[PDB]
Design a protein around this nucleic acid. Sequence first.
RNA 1: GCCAGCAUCAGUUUUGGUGGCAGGAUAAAUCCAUAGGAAUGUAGCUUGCCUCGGUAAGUAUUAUAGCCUGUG
RNA 2: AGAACUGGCGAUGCGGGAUGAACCGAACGUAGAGUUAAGGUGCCGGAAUACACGCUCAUCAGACACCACAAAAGGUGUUAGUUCAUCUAGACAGCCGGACGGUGGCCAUGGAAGUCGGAAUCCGCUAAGGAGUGUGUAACAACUCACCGGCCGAAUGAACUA
RNA 3: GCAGUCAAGCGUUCAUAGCGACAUUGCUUUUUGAUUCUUCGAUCGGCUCUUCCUAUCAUACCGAAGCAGAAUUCGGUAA
RNA 4: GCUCCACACAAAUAGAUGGAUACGAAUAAGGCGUCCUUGUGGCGUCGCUGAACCAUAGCAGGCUAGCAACGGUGCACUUGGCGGAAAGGCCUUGGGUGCUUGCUGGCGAAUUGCAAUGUCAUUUGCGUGGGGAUAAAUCAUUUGUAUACGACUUAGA
Lengths: 233, 187, 171, 134, 197, 56
Amino acid sequence: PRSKRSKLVTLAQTDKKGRENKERIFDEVREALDTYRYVWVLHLDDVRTPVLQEIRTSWAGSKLIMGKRKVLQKALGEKREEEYKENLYQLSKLCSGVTGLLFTDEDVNTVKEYFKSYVRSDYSRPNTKAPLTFTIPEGIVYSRGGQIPAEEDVPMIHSLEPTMRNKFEIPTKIKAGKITIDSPYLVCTEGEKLDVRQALILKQFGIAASEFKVKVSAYYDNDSSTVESTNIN
Amino acid sequence: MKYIQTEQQIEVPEGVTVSIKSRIVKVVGPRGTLTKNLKHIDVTFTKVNNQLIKVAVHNGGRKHVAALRTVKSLVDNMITGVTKGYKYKMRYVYAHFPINVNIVEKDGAKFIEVRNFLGDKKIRNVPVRDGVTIEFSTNVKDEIVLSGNSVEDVSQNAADLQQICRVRNKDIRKFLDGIYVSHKGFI
Amino acid sequence: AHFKEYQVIGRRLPTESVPEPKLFRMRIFASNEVIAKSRYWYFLQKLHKVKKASGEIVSINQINEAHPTKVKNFGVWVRYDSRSGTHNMYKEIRDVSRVAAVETLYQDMAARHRARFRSIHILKVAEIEKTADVKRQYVKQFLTKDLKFPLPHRVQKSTKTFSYKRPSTFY
Amino acid sequence: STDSIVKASNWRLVEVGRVVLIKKGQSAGKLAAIVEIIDQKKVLIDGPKAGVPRQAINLGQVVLTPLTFALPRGARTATVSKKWAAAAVCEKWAASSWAKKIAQRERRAALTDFERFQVMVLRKQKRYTVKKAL
Amino acid sequence: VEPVVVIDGKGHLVGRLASVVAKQLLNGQKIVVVRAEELNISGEFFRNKLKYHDFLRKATAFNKTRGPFHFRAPSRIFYKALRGMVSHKTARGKAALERLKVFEGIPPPYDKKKRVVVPQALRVLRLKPGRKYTTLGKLSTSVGWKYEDVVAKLEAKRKVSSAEYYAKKRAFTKKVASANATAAESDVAKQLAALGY
Amino acid sequence: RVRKRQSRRTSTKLKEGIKKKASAHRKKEKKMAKKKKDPGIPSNFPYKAKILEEIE
RNA sequence: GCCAGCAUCAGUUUUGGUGGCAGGAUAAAUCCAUAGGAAUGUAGCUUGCCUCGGUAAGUAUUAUAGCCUGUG
RNA sequence: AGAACUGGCGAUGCGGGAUGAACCGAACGUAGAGUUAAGGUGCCGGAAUACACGCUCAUCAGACACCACAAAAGGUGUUAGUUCAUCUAGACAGCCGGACGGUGGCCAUGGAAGUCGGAAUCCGCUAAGGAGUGUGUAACAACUCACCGGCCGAAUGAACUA
RNA sequence: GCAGUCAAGCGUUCAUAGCGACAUUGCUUUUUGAUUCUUCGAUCGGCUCUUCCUAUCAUACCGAAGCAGAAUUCGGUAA
RNA sequence: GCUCCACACAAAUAGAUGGAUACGAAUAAGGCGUCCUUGUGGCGUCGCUGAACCAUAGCAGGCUAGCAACGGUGCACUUGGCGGAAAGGCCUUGGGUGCUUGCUGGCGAAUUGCAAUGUCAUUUGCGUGGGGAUAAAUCAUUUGUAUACGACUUAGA
């Protein structure tokens, strides 16, 4: 019973959900299929909850169901035999990653134009090159780190120097409470496939200079019971 | 429970050549060669096809299985060191007394010489190990880089450096002078 | 010793009022008929109100395995009134006969638990017909396709005291 | 010559079809084929040709040979005999060094004193010619 | 089956070798042990060094000159292990121990002679693999034996001489075996084959 | 410098006294002495669904 | 007169070889025949990885290997 | 500690327990042969370094125990079991991302915004997200877990017993 | 120590008897370091000289402490 | 009084009765042979105990006649080299000297009486005449670098 790793227990309020949540999502999607006319698939791989809430508040009449890929695959039907309605696994197979499956009764073209005109700012999200380039100045670094006049900003907090020095691999010293470096550290170049620590550096300095525009792949109509594929971003 | 047979796989890239009689292991690649004795271990080796070498243990327990996994890890480290290499960057810091770090060749032995640590006249000498190369990093204040293929020798020399300059009978909350490992990685 | 399986039947003695009573049967693992009959009465006293003087044994018989060369995977229920109220155990043994399974079971219990013949109770030994009903991993180890394994340390029994060879343990 | 040269370290493996020599028991120097594996220490063997009964046996009682032949798992005695004959393992065993050593030693044991005298005379005759050759 | 038996101590276990040797001397066989510095004990070095220290702290208090005499050499360690088996306080035990000779290394005349082993005392056969063991030269040099550097220097010469001897003998054997193979196929050899030679 | 070691020799007085200690404690426990739930059909038994059928 | 060897016997004892019998499920088995069944799936077949013919998953109940159960 | 039987030593040698008045066996004429008891068969020491299955590594293991003493437990040493749970609608471990909104919730204070303290501890939108598990800040910030999701692709976790 | 509270477990084939680890309350006299300190019936101590134990006072090496240095406190190996 | 040999008799005894027959290293690895790129190589082969290998026929081993081969072995000389851990042994050259069961022949054995272990493997001591060469210590005496007495330390033809 021994020579194991002890699980670090902590005492919080929230608790795991289990199979009841998944069955609830299953029943919800299956009862909304009968209700609404059109159903769409939206690939939302890395999002902010306020952006998702904006997308949801854009229509209180239409539904948006997130959840687990394999659960929505089962609700729709992955096999041509196992399916709720006809030609539905043809849609269910399109789901790739984080899929937000939307239901509506609204016209095709309103949705199509909305989800290509909708664009927001977001972080650069590693494994994705960034359209920016940053040499930090070679003096004292500020909370924005080379984005505005330093006379606006204040120096960052001394508590971040272990983080910058170890996790971000920046060469860092501090003279009094201020953080300092000797030479201008370049972090990234445009058209350079980003890595985790570059992304974290840009996040720490507060750089949302990437275009979040949701991708839509397919679309299915209940009365026609047909699929239709439109890669629109 | 006396597992009837347990196995681990070792991947060999194209430039690397691995030679294994009884439990001696020779690994040759671009950056050089490496040798290691594993006769203490009592496992079995075998080859599949020029890129995959398997190590096996028959009728053994928990400690034997652990020895299998760490053998795999050691051979993988050898391959990584002969292909890419190991590079450890250390930085030496001071508040008042500038620590002077130099190299000396004494009887052809390559000692590292540290002077004036916290204001002492003692001269701290650290022998450099074979397969380790010291250079003083340019355009970076008070940094020294140890490069080689033996991660063991490189890390142990860095440890010797950061241990020889330990502070004695002083609050380390106040006295920050020392030599510390800044970065580990490849070449 | 090397056990045997014995069928035993008991009659508890007739009376007026009750001719031909109900003939309870049991299967026993034991070295010989004496021990088998003692165990029979030992279990029958627990189950029902009988006594060696109040009852009699009808037919002691032996049971030989139907296929004592076919290899089999036995599952055994065991229990032993220790230390708490009685608690059960399920074990799996790969062997040819119920006798061998019971023998190696008694030895394994004596080794791994210091639990003794007096302490042990055999509930049910049962062959498992289908694979994938085998639950324990040490028996699952030996059912794999085209199983092979070596014996890497050979040490040779030597009849003499001295040897002129610097011996070798190979295979 | 820049390929890996890892050793093999061949071994006589415990497998169905592996034929074995019984070094202690009632058989005492007979052959049999492993037909099934009971555990790390026990196997099921069957030799109908030399006449050993099908049984479970510990591995300490036998010694594996380098010979093997095709045999399904859990075969019966008749199938064992048929595969035995088709593979012709007895002839390979007779040709092997090992069996020749055994046969030689039992011949030496069965030798009579007169035959011993003959062997000594013949060894002298051979020694003369060999020392001449040297 | 011999007048005298030379035993190479390499790869052996001290107590088991002591037992078999003692029971041989008490039966009347003359035995000569060599290479005691390569002898082995079960258990890790630390344990047996601790044991020898436990033995070494024992001494008569009012006069140390008359107490247990702690001999440091491997030959003497083996002799102690052996003498503790034999009833050495009897004439029989004395005569038994006088049939024994223990040497560090292989000196003359035994270097030019055959050595044997005892398979029921060898480490590789008796011990299970994955078990720490101890060697006696290391132990004795730890507890104060000041001669391990000479015995190695001398064995390194003995081994070279023996290798020359073996290289000569091996070519002679090739010649002999080839001549015998050529003599074979003769009717004399066929008769000998029939009769088992 | 290793220290002493306790001895394992038993010195007869001790084993007599222990026998008497136990012979007294047994009487005391016998004097204080003056003041089931069957565990079921355990899992991992593959053919457990058949014992539920001999009831009726 | 003293010490011994051998043969045939008797009493006590120890240790080998060999034969005839009676029982048990009138041993069980192995073995022979026959009816079914299945997998740690044999042949064959289908689709592929595809390093020259080795391969993974699908089929198929003895086929160009066999096994299990019952009955006799 | 008191009484009631019983057995033995006292008066009693023999074999064993390394040795021993009261433990095991067994009671005695002088000898021989055979078989045993109790106890034992690596050497001392007469007799298997016998056979078989497991377990155990102790920086002074153990080599008759006795919930007889130290005593009630402790231990990331090991083995075998019992119970309850999670899992191809993907479990455990790792990385990555989310971790929101009313709201900087109310008292308090020089200041305290989830995290010096006191007391509420609600609803909303959710896949899930505590009026917040810890680090941190003068306060914010940032990081973190609790909880959810993506990649990975089959077993895993907890409590107990021996 | 006495008398109690609680409850992890144990628990006549007890749910509402009993036992009960770890914690914890009261009594001992007081709240503002004023306590004048204040003894109350036992049926050994001192030379020479040797060694041993560690349960270490100092010396040696380390760990943790609001440990600035200096000094000190607690602890580990060590006779 | 001591000393080499041309040896009458005594001696073999914790226990002869064919031979103590020489690689190292590893053991989840090795030995032998062979080939070549000289390697942690390729190929073949062996183990599974010395139950081996070598010797081994003759009166406790005789006296003789041959055949074939120039091999084997013993005895004493002789050449040269190696070996210092306790070497004290190992190998080698040559010529003599015998024997040879490699093969074929001829004589003798007997009565040790039906077994009795049935005895077989240095010298000091006296014949031996080899037969020549010519040291020390202790006591006593003395010294005092020493000392209870012994001892120690020195000196003395």
